[PDB]
Design goal:
Chain H: It comes from Severe acute respiratory syndrome coronavirus 2. The structure is cut from a larger assembly and holds nine copies of chain A and one copy of chain F (about 60 residues). Chain A has about 35 residues and is mainly beta. Chain A is built from no helices and four strands. In chain A, strand 3 and strand 4 form a beta hairpin. Chain A starts with 7 loop residues before the first strand and ends with a strand. With about 60 residues, chain F is mainly alpha-helical. Chain F has one domain. Chain F starts with a helix and ends in a 17-residue tail after the last helix. Classes of the chains: A mainly beta (about 35), F mainly alpha (about 60). At the B-G interface, helix 2 of B face helix 2 of G. The structure holds a molecule of 3 linked components (NAG-NAG-BMA), a molecule of 2 linked components (NAG-NAG) (4 copies) and 2-acetamido-2-deoxy-beta-D-glucopyranose (NAG) (5 copies). One 2-acetamido-2-deoxy-beta-D-glucopyranose binds next to loops of chain D.
């Protein structure tokens, strides 16, 4: 979708919370930070 | 050179949330459910 | 879980709010109040204004 | 005198420096305005005046450029801070502003004249007429005059434990000058920093003088040592002004309870 | 008429909208009556020079501009953003009169977005300038037979002046790179030159006395309102109001708004002055448009009968009945007062 | 550099002097400047027309640069 | 053209509802696929034979 | 320039309206497709044709 | 105008001075002083979401 | 007026401040271009009919 700044990408799979696009979604999870997956 | 001209006029395209691979995975899962389980998987555990 | 009904209500309220707030648009006019324009411009220009 | 230069300091502006952009009354609405404003959490100078070296004068009154506006504010206790003189070049030739606070009169003066090297006022009345006019020699060609009630209505400190927070925003556009003010006491002052609170500044006068202003100078009110000239402990803050877009939240009674910037951070822009 | 047919089928139809017509008109203006000293400005013995144009402060007075129209037979009164008669009609807060003398060739330079030596150097007008400019010949008044030199105009400066900025600079111009701190041969020059008005010149070179008025129409305090008689205020009635030029129709009622001393005009979510402050004895007032709504007909069909029923949409019957002589639109169109019982529905 | 540059420098300098006299609020000194300057534009129109420009007729110049 | 944007600012909030409508259309397009395809809670895999 | 801005804004509004109509049509088609998927893939439908 | 000026491979004929695209707007321009062909493109803007 | 002269002017630099500073009496009504903007931007063909 584009360049994402302020979130960390993890090699984990979860249900889509915040739809970013092209199969990437972000969420607020564990200290606490915004994670893209 | 056609998409670039539209983009230069502020006409962008948002990529779909579900990629083609995930849609293919959904179709494969539906095929597996309808082949190995019939209609039972559509109303509970396969 | 009643997202759809509240969503419809929000659409209606937002449409009404946008319609009423659109009166703030100058549209390129000298003012957004008809009375002020009629009180300061002559009819030859107030007509187009 | 042979005053030694002091290093400038900086302070977070926090959510301070907001004023009513117009006389129109709004209640229970979230209005967005585009005007000159002080950005939230901005560096502001921390000039502090005190009798250095236990009796040596401190000339911490530099010619701060005006640019587009200031956010002069203080935690002043008693009347020692006075004067907001302006000037393009600060000489006899250039027409300049003048705002004294003698007792209970602003005496707004717009005249061109020479300025003393270290202008200052005398807080104590002269015995037995007053030498408080030492800031300038004599006005030559006077264009505007204005006398009214003092810009501050704050009560004197009395026993103590409370100090005023006179905050002023000076704006000079389209040949006009505008003044906003608001005062409030402060409870604790151990960091000597602006409190993390919201305060709304209301207009009190508009000056129609169309004069070029590029530098800003402040004065002090000290009479005599109680060597040379000495004063008490005081500090004032200045914050520069740049165009901004602000979202103002009016309450039921019409006062700005809180406001949010539009370019401070992505969350602010989202709001 | 709405259906464009002489026969109407049974059903409900929306015909038009009813509005309570105003009962009367009230005008509220400040009660101060002293005339503004415009005659002093327009009748001064000698005007200030263009580079140091005088600025006059006008406040707390009533100004009648009709004297300018009636007298001074030769005048130029081209105005910006306001009609002349309506300028006499409407209100002002920050009125400022500036006076200077220039030749008749550069009278056009007093205009926003115009270039010229006086325009760039002596006097500059903002692009969004609101106000009139008044100019008239002054060959008789300001031209000695030998020559008039008192009027001075600026010709050289490093940078152009901002609008509504006055420069009285007399320092030596920096025409050349070398500094000289005094008038000399090669390039020192002087910023302002002098006029030499004489009666023998042509009309283009004749002196002209130009007076410009600065106007802003926000009119929150409206201290210099024009000549208008103030009528007694009417409360809780649909009456036309003229609060400091705020022409409109509505119901004025006492307000709970706590106006701050500087605040004069109230507003709402969408640019409607729902609250106003009385220019007379202080009174915070609310403005609400008087009762309106939709009008609907419940005819059971033309064939069946001509009897009809009228449904007023979203209005309480008590405060807007049919028997009131106020003639709430369509004076001849009125249902009988007690033809049938009035039913109040949701 | 011929003579036009010097003549226009003279014009500007005596216009500056005219401004000096006008601001000083002394009538006769400004009037004599007016006669001198109008004689200068007479010299200008004489010189531009092709006729030779007099030098001793006009008053002695100051220490111009 | 900064001045063109400045004069367009006088037109009021018209791009707000256009942007909202386009965003709603995009979300609707995403939800269409999400509803037509994601109808199974498990991703069944066919046996090797 | 106001004339040009009005024309461009009207063109954009017409495009948005066309997009909304097409989105409604596509949403109806997607609802039909989801119903068909549910009733034919996840089960056996007795509905004729 | 405002944009990024780069070298262009679009062969301008001797009579040709300007250059447009499918979007009926100027895309290329020849330098009025030197006989050099340039294509003007706006500097990248994109969009931002939070 | 019936035999108005037509003069062709080209390949030159134009400065319109001459009409402004000089010729004290005139009528500079203009259509389709601002006077300062007349003096500012580039033209190609100018026709003078007197
Ligand atoms: C600051 O104030 C002084 C004092 O007035 C100004 O000096 C005066 O300047 C004016 C114009 O340059 C002149 O005044 C004239 O003086 C004569 C007597 O010489 C008298 O008949 C009139 O009063 C007349 O106006 C003169 O040069 C000078 N006056 C005196 C008495 O020296 C000075 O100009 C002022 N500064 C500025 C920047 O205006
Ligand atoms: C107000 O006065 C200042 C001088 O203090 C002016 O600043 C000059 O501006 C010109 C052109 O903008 C520059 O060439 C000079 O170098 C500036 N002077 C200095 C000392 O920097 C300014 O233009 C005046 N007008 C305003 C600010 O509106
Ligand atoms: C502050 O200074 C001003 C100006 O110096 C004083 O204004 C005086 O007011 C009186 C009464 O209106 C006049 O008679 C004087 O001519 C004014 N000017 C003077 C005395 O220089 C003002 O009074 C001073 N403030 C106080 C509290 O005295
Ligand atoms: C707005 O004004 C009202 C009216 O004074 C305030 O209500 C008063 O609040 C104080 C303390 O906050 C109470 O002691 C009074 O009894 C209240 N009076 C009434 C009539 O309610 C109110 O606090 C103000 N602020 C807001 C946000 O409403
Ligand atoms: C300026 O002064 C003149 C006379 O000096 C004023 O003229 C008035 O109107 C007529 C003149 O035709 C006469 O009745 C009197 O000369 C004046 N009457 C009054 C009642 O003033 C003129 O009004 C003054 N003001 C201006 C021109 O603005
Ligand atoms: C995550 O996967 C990437 C492959 O793209 C790999 O380079 C990276 O080391 C992995 N990180 C972890 C913590 O497994
Ligand atoms: C404020 O000043 C301090 C002092 O050096 C500095 O560390 C800080 O980065 C400054 N902050 C801003 C926003 O300028
Ligand atoms: C005139 O208006 C003032 C406005 O403050 C008011 O105080 C005063 O009572 C009024 N007087 C009369 C006679 O209307
Ligand atoms: C009213 O309608 C009835 C039903 O058709 C019809 O018989 C009758 O003639 C109509 N009335 C008139 C006056 O024509
Ligand atoms: C109409 O007004 C009367 C008197 O004010 C009141 O008693 C009644 O409840 C009102 N009816 C409605 C429907 O508001």
């Amino acid at each position: 979708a584009g360049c994402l700044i302020g979130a960390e990408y993890v090699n984990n799979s979860y249900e889509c919370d915040i739809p970013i696009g092209a199969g990437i979604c972000a969420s607020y999870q564990t200290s606490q930070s915004i994670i893209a997956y | 050179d056609l998409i670039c001209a539209q983009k230069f006029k502020g006409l962008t395209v948002l990529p779909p949330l579900l990629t083609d691979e995930m849609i293919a995975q959904y179709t494969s899962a539906l095929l597996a459910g309808t082949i190995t389980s019939g209609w039972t998987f559509g109303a509970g555990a396969a | 879980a009643l997202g759809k009904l509240q969503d419809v209500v929000n659409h209606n309220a937002q449409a009404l709010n946008t319609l009423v707030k659109q009166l703030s648009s100058k549209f390129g006019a000298i003012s957004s109040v008809l009375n002020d324009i009629f009180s300061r411009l002559d009819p030859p220009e107030a007509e187009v204004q | 005198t042979t005053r030694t230069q002091l290093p400038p300091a900086y302070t977070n502006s926090f959510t301070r420096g907001v004023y009513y952009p117009d006389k129109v009354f709004r209640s229970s609405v979230l209005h967005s305005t585009q005007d000159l404003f002080l950005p939230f959490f901005s560096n502001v100078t921390w000039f502090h005046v005190i009798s250095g070296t236990n009796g040596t004068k401190r000339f911490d009154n530099p010619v701060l450029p005006f640019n587009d506006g200031v956010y002069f504010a203080s935690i002043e206790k008693s009347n020692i801070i006075r004067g907001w003189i302006f000037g393009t070049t600060l000489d006899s030739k250039t027409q300049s502003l003048l705002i004294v606070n003698n007792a209970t009169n602003v005496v707004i003066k717009v005249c061109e004249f020479q300025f003393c090297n270290d202008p200052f006022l005398d807080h104590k009345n002269n015995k037995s007429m007053e030498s408080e006019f030492r800031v300038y020699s004599s006005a030559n060609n006077c264009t505007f005059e204005y006398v009214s009630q003092p810009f501050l209505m704050d009560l004197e400190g009395k026993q103590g434990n409370f100090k005023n927070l006179r905050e002023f925003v000076f704006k000079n556009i389209d040949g006009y000058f505008k003044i906003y003010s608001k005062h409030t006491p402060i409870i604790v002052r151990e960091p000597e920093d602006l409190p993390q609170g919201f305060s709304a500044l209301e207009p009190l006068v508009d000056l129609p003088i169309g004069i070029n202003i590029t530098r800003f100078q402040t004065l002090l009110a000290l009479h005599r040592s109680y060597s040379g000239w000495t004063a008490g402990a005081a500090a004032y803050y200045v914050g520069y002004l740049q165009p901004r877009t602000f979202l103002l939240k009016y309450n039921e009674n019409g006062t700005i309870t809180d406001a949010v910037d539009c370019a401070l951070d992505p969350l602010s822009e989202t709001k | 008429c709405t259906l464009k047919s002489f026969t109407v089928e049974k059903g409900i139809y929306q015909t038009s909208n009813f509005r309570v017509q105003p009962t009367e008109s009230i005008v509220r203006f400040p009660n101060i009556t002293n005339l503004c000293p415009f005659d002093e400005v327009f009748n001064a013995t000698r005007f200030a020079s263009v580079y140091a144009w005088n600025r006059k402060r006008i406040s707390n007075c009533v100004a009648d501009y009709s004297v300018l129209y009636n007298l001074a037979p030769f005048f130029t009164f081209k105005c910006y953003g306001v009609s002349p008669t309506k300028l006499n009609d409407l209100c002002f807060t920050n009125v400022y009169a500036d006076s200077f003398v220039i030749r008749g060739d550069e009278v056009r330079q007093i205009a926003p977005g115009q270039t010229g030596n006086i325009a760039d150097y002596n006097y500059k007008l903002p692009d969004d300038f609101t106000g009139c400019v008044i100019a008239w010949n002054s060959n008789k008044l300001d031209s000695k037979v030998s020559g008039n030199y008192n009027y001075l105009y600026r010709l050289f400066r490093k940078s152009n002046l901002k609008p509504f900025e006055r420069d009285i600079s007399t320092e030596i111009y920096q025409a050349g790179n070398k500094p000289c701190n005094g008038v000399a041969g090669f390039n020192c020059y002087f910023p302002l030159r002098s006029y030499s008005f004489r009666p023998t010149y042509g009309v283009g070179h004749q002196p002209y006395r130009v007076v410009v008025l600065s106007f802003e129409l926000l009119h929150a305090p409206a201290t210099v309102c024009g000549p208008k008689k103030s009528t007694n205020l009417v409360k809780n009635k649909c009456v036309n109001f003229n609060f400091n030029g705020l022409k409109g129709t509505g119901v004025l009622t006492e307000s709970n708004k706590k106006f701050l001393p500087f605040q004069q005009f109230g507003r709402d979510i969408a640019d409607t002055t729902d609250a106003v402050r009385d220019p007379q004895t202080l009174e915070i007032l609310d403005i609400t448009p008087c009762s309106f709504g939709g009008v609907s007909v419940i005819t059971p069909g033309t064939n069946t009968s001509n009897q009809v029923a009228v449904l007023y949409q979203g209005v309480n019957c008590t405060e807007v009945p049919v028997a009131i002589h106020a003639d709430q639109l369509t004076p001849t169109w009125r249902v009988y007062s007690t033809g049938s019982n009035v039913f109040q529905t949701r | 550099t011929n003579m036009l540059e010097a003549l226009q420098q003279r014009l500007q300098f005596y216009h500056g002097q005219v401004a000096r006299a006008a601001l000083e609020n002394n009538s006769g000194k400004a009037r004599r400047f007016g006669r001198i300057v109008k004689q200068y534009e007479d010299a200008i129109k004489l010189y531009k027309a092709g006729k030779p420009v007099p030098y001793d007729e006009l008053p002695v110049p100051p220490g111009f640069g | 053209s900064t001045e063109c944007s400045n004069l367009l600012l006088q037109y009021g909030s018209f791009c707000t509802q256009l942007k909202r409508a386009l965003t709603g259309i995009a979300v609707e397009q995403d939800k269409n696929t999400q509803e037509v395809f994601a109808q199974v809670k498990q991703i069944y895999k066919t046996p090797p034979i | 320039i106001d004339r040009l801005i009005t024309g461009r804004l009207q063109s954009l509004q017409t495009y948005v309206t066309q997009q909304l109509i097409r989105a409604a049509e596509i949403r109806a088609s997607a609802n039909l497709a989801a119903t068909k998927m549910s009733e034919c893939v996840l089960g056996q439908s007795k509905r004729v044709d």
